[PDB]
Amino acid sequence: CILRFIACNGQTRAVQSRGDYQKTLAIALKKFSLEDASKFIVCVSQSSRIKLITEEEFKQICFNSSSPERDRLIIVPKEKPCPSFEDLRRSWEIE
After folding, report:
1. Beta bridge partners of 43
2. What angle do CA 55, 93, 83 make, to 5 degrees?
3. Does residue 94 contact residue 24 with C-beta atoms inside 8 Å?
4. Which one of 17, 30, 31, 60 is most buried, counting C-beta atoms within 10 A?
5. Which residues have CB under 8 Å from 28's CB, separation 6+?
6. Cβ-contact 30, 37 below 8 angstroms
7. Are 47 and 83 in contact (CB under 8 A)?
8. CA 60, CA 37: separation in Å to the nearest integer?
9. Is 4 in a helix, a strand, or coil?
10. What angle do CA 76, 5, 78 make, to 5 degrees?
């Protein structure tokens, strides 16, 4: 189906997903923040801060809170992350 990915503090885009988060994470980021993203990882809102997101598990691990379909995700570089203000603002509610 369609998935949403947001990366960096203010870099937001929405792309279809269904073949693991790797393509979504790697290609999403390539056009979105940088390029050659598979290094990268995705993170989603949990309690106080952002939770780490892996491969296919990433939707279920972060979204575990029980949400409809997959969307509110954030792209972050593997070498060294930093994003978080994304799932935080304009996402805290129920997007």
Report:
1. 52, 74
2. 45
3. no
4. 17
5. 5, 7, 13, 15, 37, 75
6. yes
7. no
8. 21
9. strand
10. 15
- DSSP assignment, residue 32? H
Taking every pair of C-alpha atoms in the chain, what is the biggest distance, in angstroms? 31
Domain ranges of the chain: 1-95
Contacts of 59 (CB under 8 A, 6+ apart): 3, 21, 53, 70, 73
Distance of CA 21 to the CA centre of its chain: 9
